[PDB]
Each structure stands twice: as C-alpha cells, then as structure tokens.
Design a protein around this motif. Structure first.
Motif, PDB file in Angstrom:
ATOM      1  N   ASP A 198      12.960  26.269  -1.134  1.00  0.00           N
ATOM      2  CA  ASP A 198      13.822  25.087  -1.192  1.00  0.00           C
ATOM      3  C   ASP A 198      14.411  24.980  -2.605  1.00  0.00           C
ATOM      4  OD1 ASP A 198      14.997  22.515  -1.269  1.00  0.00           O
ATOM      5  OD2 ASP A 198      13.239  21.478  -0.457  1.00  0.00           O
ATOM      6  N   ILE A 199      15.713  25.234  -2.708  1.00  0.00           N
ATOM      7  CA  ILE A 199      16.426  25.195  -4.003  1.00  0.00           C
ATOM      8  C   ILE A 199      16.318  23.833  -4.723  1.00  0.00           C
ATOM      9  CG2 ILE A 199      18.717  24.599  -3.032  1.00  0.00           C
ATOM     10  CD1 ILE A 199      19.886  26.692  -5.105  1.00  0.00           C
ATOM     11  N   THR A 200      16.146  22.738  -3.969  1.00  0.00           N
ATOM     12  CA  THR A 200      16.037  21.399  -4.591  1.00  0.00           C
ATOM     13  C   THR A 200      14.742  21.158  -5.388  1.00  0.00           C
ATOM     14  OG1 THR A 200      15.122  20.182  -2.672  1.00  0.00           O
ATOM     15  CG2 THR A 200      17.540  20.408  -2.823  1.00  0.00           C
ATOM     16  N   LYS A 201      13.774  22.064  -5.273  1.00  0.00           N
ATOM     17  CA  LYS A 201      12.535  21.987  -6.064  1.00  0.00           C
ATOM     18  C   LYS A 201      12.581  22.823  -7.358  1.00  0.00           C
ATOM     19  CE  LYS A 201      10.586  19.395  -3.892  1.00  0.00           C
ATOM     20  NZ  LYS A 201      10.808  18.155  -3.079  1.00  0.00           N
ATOM     21  N   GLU A 202      13.691  23.525  -7.606  1.00  0.00           N
ATOM     22  CA  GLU A 202      13.843  24.364  -8.802  1.00  0.00           C
ATOM     23  C   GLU A 202      14.282  23.570 -10.030  1.00  0.00           C
ATOM     24  OE1 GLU A 202      13.470  27.935  -9.120  1.00  0.00           O
ATOM     25  OE2 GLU A 202      12.388  27.609  -7.237  1.00  0.00           O
ATOM     26  N   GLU A 203      13.923  24.090 -11.207  1.00  0.00           N
ATOM     27  CA  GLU A 203      14.429  23.592 -12.489  1.00  0.00           C
ATOM     28  C   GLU A 203      15.333  24.674 -13.127  1.00  0.00           C
ATOM     29  OE1 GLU A 203      11.381  22.218 -15.302  1.00  0.00           O
ATOM     30  OE2 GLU A 203      12.755  22.497 -16.987  1.00  0.00           O
ATOM     31  N   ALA A 204      16.526  24.275 -13.579  1.00  0.00           N
ATOM     32  CA  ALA A 204      17.484  25.184 -14.247  1.00  0.00           C
ATOM     33  C   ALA A 204      18.515  24.334 -14.966  1.00  0.00           C
ATOM     34  CB  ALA A 204      18.164  26.113 -13.247  1.00  0.00           C
ATOM     35  N   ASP A 205      19.243  24.903 -15.931  1.00  0.00           N
ATOM     36  CA  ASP A 205      20.341  24.143 -16.542  1.00  0.00           C
ATOM     37  C   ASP A 205      21.403  23.748 -15.500  1.00  0.00           C
ATOM     38  OD1 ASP A 205      19.308  24.072 -19.215  1.00  0.00           O
ATOM     39  OD2 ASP A 205      20.067  26.109 -19.580  1.00  0.00           O
ATOM     40  N   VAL A 206      21.790  24.704 -14.644  1.00  0.00           N
ATOM     41  CA  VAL A 206      22.723  24.462 -13.529  1.00  0.00           C
ATOM     42  C   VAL A 206      22.086  24.874 -12.205  1.00  0.00           C
ATOM     43  CG1 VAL A 206      24.827  25.439 -12.436  1.00  0.00           C
ATOM     44  CG2 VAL A 206      24.938  24.400 -14.712  1.00  0.00           C
ATOM     45  N   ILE A 207      22.239  23.995 -11.201  1.00  0.00           N
ATOM     46  CA  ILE A 207      22.002  24.325  -9.790  1.00  0.00           C
ATOM     47  C   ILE A 207      23.359  24.350  -9.080  1.00  0.00           C
ATOM     48  CG2 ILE A 207      20.965  23.585  -7.588  1.00  0.00           C
ATOM     49  CD1 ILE A 207      18.534  22.499  -9.333  1.00  0.00           C
ATOM     50  N   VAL A 208      23.578  25.359  -8.235  1.00  0.00           N
ATOM     51  CA  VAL A 208      24.842  25.514  -7.481  1.00  0.00           C
ATOM     52  C   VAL A 208      24.688  24.994  -6.033  1.00  0.00           C
ATOM     53  CG1 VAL A 208      26.578  27.196  -6.630  1.00  0.00           C
ATOM     54  CG2 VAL A 208      25.572  27.452  -8.922  1.00  0.00           C
ATOM     55  N   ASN A 209      25.659  24.183  -5.591  1.00  0.00           N
ATOM     56  CA  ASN A 209      25.777  23.746  -4.188  1.00  0.00           C
ATOM     57  C   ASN A 209      26.884  24.557  -3.490  1.00  0.00           C
ATOM     58  OD1 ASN A 209      25.483  22.168  -1.814  1.00  0.00           O
ATOM     59  ND2 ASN A 209      26.769  20.502  -2.618  1.00  0.00           N
ATOM     60  N   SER A 210      26.675  24.905  -2.215  1.00  0.00           N
ATOM     61  CA  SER A 210      27.675  25.611  -1.381  1.00  0.00           C
ATOM     62  C   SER A 210      28.149  24.623  -0.318  1.00  0.00           C
ATOM     63  CB  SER A 210      27.034  26.847  -0.745  1.00  0.00           C
ATOM     64  OG  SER A 210      27.962  27.624   0.019  1.00  0.00           O
ATOM     65  N   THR A 211      29.400  24.179  -0.416  1.00  0.00           N
ATOM     66  CA  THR A 211      29.893  23.032   0.368  1.00  0.00           C
ATOM     67  C   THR A 211      31.300  23.289   0.955  1.00  0.00           C
ATOM     68  OG1 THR A 211      30.110  20.591   0.330  1.00  0.00           O
ATOM     69  CG2 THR A 211      30.797  21.765  -1.677  1.00  0.00           C
ATOM     70  N   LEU A 266      17.997  15.800  -9.119  1.00  0.00           N
ATOM     71  CA  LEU A 266      17.559  17.193  -9.220  1.00  0.00           C
ATOM     72  C   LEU A 266      17.139  17.516 -10.658  1.00  0.00           C
ATOM     73  CD1 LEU A 266      20.226  19.085  -7.063  1.00  0.00           C
ATOM     74  CD2 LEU A 266      17.877  18.793  -6.454  1.00  0.00           C
ATOM     75  N   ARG A 267      16.337  18.566 -10.804  1.00  0.00           N
ATOM     76  CA  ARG A 267      15.841  19.026 -12.107  1.00  0.00           C
ATOM     77  C   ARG A 267      16.840  20.002 -12.771  1.00  0.00           C
ATOM     78  NH1 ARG A 267       9.732  20.822 -12.474  1.00  0.00           N
ATOM     79  NH2 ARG A 267      10.275  21.869 -10.496  1.00  0.00           N
ATOM     80  N   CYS A 268      17.991  19.455 -13.144  1.00  0.00           N
ATOM     81  CA  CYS A 268      19.042  20.234 -13.793  1.00  0.00           C
ATOM     82  C   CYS A 268      19.916  19.327 -14.634  1.00  0.00           C
ATOM     83  CB  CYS A 268      19.885  21.021 -12.772  1.00  0.00           C
ATOM     84  SG  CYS A 268      20.883  20.040 -11.624  1.00  0.00           S
ATOM     85  N   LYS A 269      20.717  19.942 -15.507  1.00  0.00           N
ATOM     86  CA  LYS A 269      21.668  19.210 -16.347  1.00  0.00           C
ATOM     87  C   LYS A 269      22.991  18.949 -15.616  1.00  0.00           C
ATOM     88  CE  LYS A 269      19.621  21.073 -20.634  1.00  0.00           C
ATOM     89  NZ  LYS A 269      19.635  22.242 -21.563  1.00  0.00           N
ATOM     90  N   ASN A 270      23.461  19.912 -14.812  1.00  0.00           N
ATOM     91  CA  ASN A 270      24.687  19.757 -13.997  1.00  0.00           C
ATOM     92  C   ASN A 270      24.517  20.480 -12.668  1.00  0.00           C
ATOM     93  OD1 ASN A 270      26.187  19.941 -17.072  1.00  0.00           O
ATOM     94  ND2 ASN A 270      27.036  18.395 -15.676  1.00  0.00           N
ATOM     95  N   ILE A 271      25.209  19.975 -11.644  1.00  0.00           N
ATOM     96  CA  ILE A 271      25.390  20.696 -10.383  1.00  0.00           C
ATOM     97  C   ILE A 271      26.832  21.202 -10.367  1.00  0.00           C
ATOM     98  CG2 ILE A 271      25.420  20.570  -7.852  1.00  0.00           C
ATOM     99  CD1 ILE A 271      23.524  18.019  -8.221  1.00  0.00           C
ATOM    100  N   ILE A 272      27.021  22.493 -10.048  1.00  0.00           N
ATOM    101  CA  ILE A 272      28.375  23.026  -9.785  1.00  0.00           C
ATOM    102  C   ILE A 272      28.505  23.240  -8.269  1.00  0.00           C
ATOM    103  CG2 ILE A 272      30.112  24.793 -10.278  1.00  0.00           C
ATOM    104  CD1 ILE A 272      28.854  25.241 -13.035  1.00  0.00           C
ATOM    105  N   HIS A 273      29.459  22.527  -7.669  1.00  0.00           N
ATOM    106  CA  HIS A 273      29.686  22.536  -6.217  1.00  0.00           C
ATOM    107  C   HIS A 273      30.843  23.516  -5.939  1.00  0.00           C
ATOM    108  CE1 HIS A 273      27.532  18.490  -5.869  1.00  0.00           C
ATOM    109  NE2 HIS A 273      27.937  18.462  -7.129  1.00  0.00           N
ATOM    110  N   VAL A 274      30.518  24.647  -5.311  1.00  0.00           N
ATOM    111  CA  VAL A 274      31.518  25.668  -4.949  1.00  0.00           C
ATOM    112  C   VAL A 274      31.795  25.591  -3.434  1.00  0.00           C
ATOM    113  CG1 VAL A 274      30.800  27.153  -6.881  1.00  0.00           C
ATOM    114  CG2 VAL A 274      29.931  27.649  -4.590  1.00  0.00           C
ATOM    115  N   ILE A 275      32.932  26.147  -3.010  1.00  0.00           N
ATOM    116  CA  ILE A 275      33.354  26.124  -1.594  1.00  0.00           C
ATOM    117  C   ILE A 275      32.779  27.367  -0.899  1.00  0.00           C
ATOM    118  CG2 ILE A 275      35.322  26.116   0.005  1.00  0.00           C
ATOM    119  CD1 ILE A 275      36.911  24.698  -2.319  1.00  0.00           C
ATOM    120  N   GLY A 276      31.916  27.149   0.098  1.00  0.00           N
ATOM    121  CA  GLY A 276      31.240  28.241   0.786  1.00  0.00           C
ATOM    122  C   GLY A 276      32.160  29.291   1.417  1.00  0.00           C
ATOM    123  N   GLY A 277      33.330  28.855   1.886  1.00  0.00           N
ATOM    124  CA  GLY A 277      34.326  29.742   2.508  1.00  0.00           C
ATOM    125  C   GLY A 277      35.164  30.562   1.538  1.00  0.00           C
ATOM    126  N   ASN A 278      35.133  30.232   0.244  1.00  0.00           N
ATOM    127  CA  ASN A 278      35.906  30.972  -0.765  1.00  0.00           C
ATOM    128  C   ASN A 278      35.271  32.315  -1.099  1.00  0.00           C
ATOM    129  OD1 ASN A 278      37.741  28.846  -0.996  1.00  0.00           O
ATOM    130  ND2 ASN A 278      37.465  28.566  -3.189  1.00  0.00           N
TER     131      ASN A 278
END
Ligand SMILES: COc1cc(N2CCOCC2)ccc1N
Ligand SMILES: [Cl-]
Ligand SMILES: [Cl-]
Length: 182
Positions: A29-42, A87-99
């Motif tokens: 489960d990616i939501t339990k990770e710690e990192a500077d950035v976590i990426v979302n696929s949306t 979440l345990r991160c400084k920023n979330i970067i939300h990318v487009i899953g279809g790209n």
C-alpha cells in the motif's frame, strides 16, 4: 553502461543501481510509505477515486482534494503538484494515468531536482483505470530514469521506489530489471 546488479535488501524488496540512483520495487500500500514525493496516477480532471487514486485521496484528505480541483479549473495541466496532506511526504505529484509514462516520470524527476528532494515513491502508473500494459509501463519507468542519468541530471535525487498493489505486476518489473543488469 549505467546498470548495477539486482539484489534483495529486505523481504519482498528488489533493487539495483542506475548510475548514482538506487532503484527499488516492492508490493504493498503506497499510502503507508514515507518519501519526499509520492506520485498519484489519476484522470485528466485530477478528481478520480478508484484503485490507487482512491487510497491516495482518502488518506491525503479533503484539503488535497480541494487543491486538485482548484488547479484543474485554472489551466490545462499535464500534472499538478499539491501538499502531502496526511500522507508521509512533502508533496504529492498527480500525473495522468493515460499519458505517456516515460514523459510523466521525466517530469516527476525534474520537479524533484527543482526542490532539492532525495526520495520518490510511485505506483505502477497507468496500470489501473487507464489499462496500459504492465511490461510497457515497466519499460517506460526505467527508461525515464536511464535518460535522466545519461544527461547528467541526477544531483539531489538518490532513491526511486515503485510500490505496486498487485504482486503479479511486481513480477513484470523484476524481469525488466534483470534484462538490464550489468
Ligand atoms: C491501490 O491500487 C489498486 C487497487 C486495486 N484493488 C482495490 C481493492 O479491491 C480490488 C483491487 C486494484 C489495482 C490497483 N492498482
Ligand atoms: Cl491508472
Ligand atoms: Cl499499483
């Protein structure tokens, strides 16, 4: 040229060097990770709540949800950057899953250098609602990291980890790493 050796530092985790960067894969489960950035696929509207995107928006919270829809209306975005919420991160970067996945990962790497960040955690981008094929996704993610290293762009970025919901998709990433190893 750039690839080290594939090994397992911990149970269920596999890693190899790509230039100076440690590249890792694991299932969970990616939501339990710690990192500077976590990426979302949306989606292209940045308001999807299915699979990875469900877990990320639910755990991150309503302020992050609101941030996403406000930036979505402002301009046409290939990706957006928000706070981490709960979440345990400084920023979330939300990318487009279809790209194009290689392009999406290249953009994440460049944005992390701009912030002097060292660690990134991403899902198997595009394998959820977008229904891109797992081996094309694995090839694209690792190719983006190779290109970033080849151009001499790695300075602050030290660790890139893919946390993958389905164990069968992990298999595909491991095989791709083995194809490339020195
Ligand atoms: C977190 O991302 C995913 C979640 C699920 N499922 C949710 C639980 O029940 C059905 C499978 C399937 C695929 C992905 N990528
Ligand atoms: Cl997706
Ligand atoms: Cl996943």
């Amino acid at each position: 040229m750039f690839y080290g050796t594939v090994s397992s530092p911990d149970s269920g985790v596999y890693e190899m060097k790509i230039g100076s960067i440690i590249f890792q894969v694991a299932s969970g489960d990616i939501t339990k990770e710690e990192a500077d950035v976590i990426v979302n696929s949306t989606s292209n509207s940045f308001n999807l709540k299915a699979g990875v995107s469900k877990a990320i928006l639910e755990c991150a919270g309503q302020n992050v949800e609101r941030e996403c829809s406000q930036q979505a209306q402002q301009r046409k975005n290939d990706y957006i950057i928000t706070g981490g919420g709960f979440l345990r991160c400084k920023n979330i970067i939300h990318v487009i899953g279809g790209n194009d996945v290689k392009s999406s990962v290249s953009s994440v790497l460049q944005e992390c250098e701009k912030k002097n960040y060292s660690s990134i955690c991403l899902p198997a981008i595009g394998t959820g609602n977008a229904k891109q094929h797992p081996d094309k996704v694995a090839e694209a993610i690792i190719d983006a990291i190779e290109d970033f290293v080849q151009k001499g762009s790695a300075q602050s970025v030290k660790k890139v980890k893919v946390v993958i919901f389905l164990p069968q998709v992990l298999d595909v990433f491991y095989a791709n790493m083995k194809k490339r190893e020195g």
